[PDB]
From a paper:
SAS-6 organizes the rotationally ninefold symmetric cartwheel, an early assembly intermediate of centrioles that participates in establishing their symmetry and diameter. High-resolution crystal structures of zebrafish and C. reinhardtii SAS-6 fragments together with biochemical and biophysical characterizations demonstrated that two dimerization interfaces in SAS-6 mediate this oligomerization: a coiled-coil domain that forms a rod-like parallel dimer; and a globular N-terminal domain that forms a curved head-to-head dimer.
The unit cell of the Lm SAS-697–320 crystal form contained three 9-fold symmetric SAS-6 rings with three SAS-6 dimers constituting the ASU. These three dimers were highly similar to each other and overlayed with an rmsd of 0.88 ± 0.29 Å in secondary structure matching with 357 ± 14 selected pairs. The inner diameters of the SAS-6 rings are ∼19 nm and correspond well to the diameters of cartwheel hubs observed in vivo. The ASU of the crystal contained six SAS-6 monomers that are labelled from A–F. No clear electron density could be seen for the distal part of the coiled-coil of the A–B dimer, probably due to the lack of stabilizing crystal packing interactions compared to the C–D and E–F dimer.
Residue numbers in the entry:
A (entry chain D): 130 to 317
B (entry chain C): 129 to 317
C (entry chain E): 208 to 264
The structure:
């Protein structure tokens, strides 16, 4: 049953205090599926990546059971099913340029190697002030987890490359064979 | 004079995790000369062994030109540092291509890949009398940091190669569809 | 700036009192009775389908 609701790139204001923030394009991947202690809990996963840096991998994994606390702390007004649906709605809207909002990501230290987390925020600028719409703490991944990520994406695109070899090979042949039919129609 | 992949292919290898019974698997073999070492200006030979069915199966022997004389004496080799990878690869390519009578073997120092930190790679000749060993190389399993680079490297590679095949498909799918519409109208005439 | 803060604050609150605002006012004390409290948090809240969005505190 797992399902990716969003997988795209978006400019994000990343900040490693006390350094000055700087805008980078970042990957956003959001996927629902199954996990937890006994592997039968519904999960929502939020994943943040940097195409310019393979080790830049921050994730929030949310188990359905922990959600009531989550909904309360963040004052959400949707159930576990709508949360990732609205989150990607909000984020995709920003990435699409249809949003007045901007994306921000603040790490808990001045360097990436010493950080273990970041707070990703959806921010609105008004004349009065920046208004915060949502806040999520994302944890930086551990190596073993990370190896899987790379290895996962490694295996993924290797297949996808081969698949395009198959598509190129079949369609090259169909339409190349079509020249010969329509060559005889020209002869007519 | 400049770095070079001398070999990058797949070949059947007899893999053995003692005390378990050996088993034959297809393994990746990559052999590359280039620059490396303590000060990064030493000529190196790299031998890399992989398993397409297993991303963590990543074993390497890295050899520095400074270290080679010991290597040469110990293994009773009769070529210099420059010829060694050409002949190693000569031998391996002969095997992968099927032109060799020889076989490949890889024996781990433990019962699981997870518990190993090394393996011995051997080129073996079967005779009526006995197995005759032609060469043996110990390869070390990589530390996490090394491996993450390998995966990330291969990650970025095939992501691009995929993108390129979309471009190639786009070229051929679009032109040839454009040709169908032209000559389909020529049939209509 | 300091000059605008009360203008926008009052802008926001006055907007609410007149009924021209979509926003609501909230006040949460640090205890269960007024006699034991010494403070409260006053918030301007926006209701969305997704969540309450806080505008000022």
């Amino acid at each position: 049953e797992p399902q990716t609701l969003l997988e795209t790139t978006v400019m994000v204001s990343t900040k490693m205090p006390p350094h000055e923030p700087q805008v980078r394009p970042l990957g956003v991947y959001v996927r629902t599926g199954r996990g937890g202690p006994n592997g039968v809990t519904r999960v929502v996963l939020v994943r943040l990546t940097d195409p310019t840096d393979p080790f830049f991998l921050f994730e929030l994994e949310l188990l359905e059971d922990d959600y009531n606390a989550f909904k309360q702390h963040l004052e959400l007004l949707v159930d576990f099913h709508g949360f990732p649906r609205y989150l990607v709605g909000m984020l995709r809207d920003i990435a699409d340029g249809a949003s007045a909002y901007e994306l921000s990501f603040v790490l808990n230290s001045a360097a990436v190697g010493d950080s273990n987390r970041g707070t990703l925020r959806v921010l609105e600028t008004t004349d009065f002030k920046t208004v915060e719409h949502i806040s999520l703490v994302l944890l930086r991944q551990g190596d073993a987890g990370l190896k899987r990520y790379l290895a996962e994406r490694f295996q993924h695109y290797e297949q996808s490359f081969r698949a395009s070899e198959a598509s190129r090979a079949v369609i090259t042949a169909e339409l190349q064979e079509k020249i010969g039919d329509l060559q005889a129609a020209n002869d007519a």
